[PDB]
């Protein structure tokens, strides 16, 4: 049918942040960091508008791949504030034809 072996996901997260926050994303493999908030991956508030206060990262992963991941905020301090229990979880879809997919989660 046709596979693809990498899957260009992205996350895309709704949270209302201060001027001075930043965000990124942590995750149980070596590519989300794994899981070090140093190693993490920012989001980009390039789409954030009042009405769709969105923060979003495309991240390349190989299909089927399982993780947990969380979100983390950065105020200037570098005081890191991370989302609430429990982990998030993802498995990378396989799936005919598929190269895209989207994660739409709101930070809790």
């Given at each position: 049918c046709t596979t693809?072996?990498?899957?260009?996901?992205?996350f895309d997260l709704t949270a209302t942040t201060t001027y001075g926050e930043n965000?990124?994303?942590?995750?149980?493999?070596?590519q989300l960091g794994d899981w070090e908030t140093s190693d993490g991956i920012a989001l980009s508030a390039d789409k954030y508008t009042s009405s769709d206060p969105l923060w979003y990262v495309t991240v390349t992963l190989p299909a089927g791949e399982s993780f947990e991941y969380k979100f983390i905020r950065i105020e200037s301090d570098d005081s890191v504030e991370?989302?609430?229990?429990?982990?998030?979880?993802?498995?990378?879809?396989?799936?005919?034809?598929?190269?895209?997919?989207?994660?739409?989660?709101?930070?809790?």
């Open positions: 693809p072996t990498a899957v260009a996901v992205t965000i990124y994303l942590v995750g149980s493999i070596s991370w989302e609430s229990d429990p982990n998030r979880e993802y498995t990378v879809p396989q799936a005919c034809g598929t190269s895209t997919a989207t994660v739409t989660d709101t930070w809790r």
